[PDB]
Amino acid sequence: SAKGIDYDKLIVRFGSSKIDKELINRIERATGQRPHHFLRRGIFFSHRDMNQVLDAYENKKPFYLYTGRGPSSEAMHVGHLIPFIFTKWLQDVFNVPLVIQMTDDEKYLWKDLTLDQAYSYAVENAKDIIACGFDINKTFIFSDLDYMGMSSGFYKNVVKIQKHVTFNQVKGIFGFTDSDCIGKISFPAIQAAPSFSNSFPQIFRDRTDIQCLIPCAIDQDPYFRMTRDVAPRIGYPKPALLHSTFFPALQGAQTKMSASDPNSSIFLTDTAKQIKTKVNKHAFSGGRDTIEEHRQFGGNCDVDVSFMYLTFFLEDDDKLEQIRKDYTSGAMLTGELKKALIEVLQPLIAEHQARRKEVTDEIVKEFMTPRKLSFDFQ
Amino acid sequence: WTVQTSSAKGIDYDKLIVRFGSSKIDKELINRIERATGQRPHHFLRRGIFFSHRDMNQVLDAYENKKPFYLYTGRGPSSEAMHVGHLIPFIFTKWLQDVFNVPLVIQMTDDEKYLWKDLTLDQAYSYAVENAKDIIACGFDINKTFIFSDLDYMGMSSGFYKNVVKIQKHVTFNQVKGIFGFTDSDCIGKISFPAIQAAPSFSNSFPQIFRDRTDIQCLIPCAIDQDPYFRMTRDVAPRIGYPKPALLHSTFFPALQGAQTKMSASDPNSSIFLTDTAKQIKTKVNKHAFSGGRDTIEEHRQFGGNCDVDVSFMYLTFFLEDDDKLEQIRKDYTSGAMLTGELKKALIEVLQPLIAEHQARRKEVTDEIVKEFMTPRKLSFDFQHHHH
């Protein structure tokens, strides 16, 4: 479907629960802040135990944030930023510590990479993540390869989890086969491990009762569905989830943007010209065949990739609505909608590149150094 | 354990060597060890207890060309209960360390036991520490040996987990399915554990001790039941740029009721535990050690005893140091001149001081000592690793 995938159905067959006006109102109530547009516009549409997190936050109880990034390469696209942009907002609004897993071991196992390459992509991607604005005093960005060997609790949990997840379970959840290397088969435990606070003793005082909130693209849910199942089996609380939709590929919402097909992506390193070019020449249009027909029948926002992008990056709700109405009425031609998006993306990407340029190795190193964060858990 | 576990003579090891594709330790190899070490080869070697190997000549070539090599063996801490059989590989390894003068690495697989058994991480780990005491009691040099818990070292090593992952990358579920008989129903922890046992075969898993060196020859002494793990390790090694580990296989220490089984810590009276009192040792031998003697004393004087099925005699071949006395007991038992009671009495006079001495040495292992042994650190050996 050109309308993108059916998320309402995805929620159902996934067992998650939808983020309704009720939950969005509570989030605004508890925080006293207007909810981020990702929630208002349905971009972050699903969740698991978000009310629990809210209860905890409601009663001054602690909780922490956790997301990850598979460093497949030094090239990242705007799609990759969505969950991070949101996680950064969550960190500022709730003012909690954040844990960001860089699965360099995952990509070593799955791709034709060297340990050093994989590790090197984590460090490089971390600069982009730091460019999103995370507070150096409230966030630990770690590489699985490095951290496994310098944590008195990370591996211990990986093992616990490994004892409670069978090969059948992962064949059924992730689709592994008898031909997959043992590394792949047991990897899910690595990604599940950061859901438990005692995986990070340096930041949590050996405590294991701290609520964990995991914001992520819906495609990561199977790992945490599995995590939540074992949490009780090993005496730990279930991590909560906040699911986001996929950022659409240029060719159409039928697919999500993917570094695999570079033609469907707008990279964080693309020049202003390349951005303009990819949008004009490749962004699927919900507009009409001829401009005459466009003026007459108007465009279809529900399948127009450029409009969808504005939904993610145009913050002003009024300007977005105006644009929706004028495109739907024909008052605006896809060429203008296109130009409107381009004027939003170019600065968004240029600014990001400017931020990235500021994060030095000394800075990346501190972010990645296991340490006590400016929080007290006693 | 597959063929011969029915015969009273125990497993057929020469037929096991062919199956496993290993090499038999013959007189040439034994004499080469003697010439290379300037020592009389340990009796386990002289008597065929350590009968098989893989690349031992490679280790010897390296040693003779002044190249270095290190030792690697391990223990699965199923419980605090260790028996006489568990000492065999350690006693031999301790001899290998003194004789060749090389660093030693000993893996305590608490994670393996946590995976396979009904234990808590703290239990498994404490078993590692306790067992570590008995192992230290075998006389290992604290300046030449590093004993580590898996649960501990994994989380404090810059090279261990990396090698485990490299190994995990080159071993398929199918591969371990056909080697260890794993199945779709096992936990993922087990499926991949073989990589944990494989990892210490490579020197860069111990950066502190070998200074990031990646080419140091490794010798693994163990009971043949551990070979599968290393047939696998030897396979992946080249695939990941590392040298293959050499091996020295030992036979199984017999269970009291017969060489049909292997002495297992599960059967309290199938073994002579290191904690047993003099009286308990005496009792176990006389009452439970399968006899190769004849049904009646008359048949015995006429047709003599059978040393190939007699458990007490098998134990003597493992612990009676004096070759001549062992032969005399063998000759006399076979001729029927000696009764099983007398043979039994000889073994008891050997086992009691042995176990007594071990229990006494183990009492000398203070908390601080076990800690230093398990603390990653540079050992009394230097390795040069130059590069720009």
Ligand SMILES: Nc1ncnc2c1ncn2[C@@H]1O[C@H](COP(=O)(O)OC(=O)[C@@H](N)Cc2c[nH]c3ccccc23)[C@@H](O)[C@H]1O
């Ligand atoms: N009946 C017997 N007769 C003689 N020696 C025996 C007997 N039963 C056990 N052993 C030796 O004891 C050590 C521990 O083996 P476990 O199976 O307890 O422990 C285990 O489960 C191993 N996977 C632990 C391990 C980890 N890495 C290693 C490297 C080499 C040898 C062993 C290991 C071993 O040295 C073993 O050869």
Ligand SMILES: N[C@@H](Cc1c[nH]c2ccccc12)C(=O)O
């Ligand atoms: N496995 C994810 C990265 C990741 C690890 N942990 C996470 C937690 C939340 C979101 C993503 C992650 C990927 O391949 O991209």
Ligand SMILES: [Cl-]
């Ligand atoms: Cl609603």
Ligand SMILES: [Cl-]
């Ligand atoms: Cl309400």
Ligand SMILES: [Cl-]
């Ligand atoms: Cl690839």
Ligand SMILES: [Cl-]
């Ligand atoms: Cl010979």
Ligand SMILES: [Cl-]
């Ligand atoms: Cl033999």
Ligand SMILES: [Cl-]
């Ligand atoms: Cl058990």
Ligand SMILES: [Cl-]
């Ligand atoms: Cl490799």
Ligand SMILES: [Cl-]
């Ligand atoms: Cl008589």
Ligand SMILES: [Cl-]
């Ligand atoms: Cl140098």
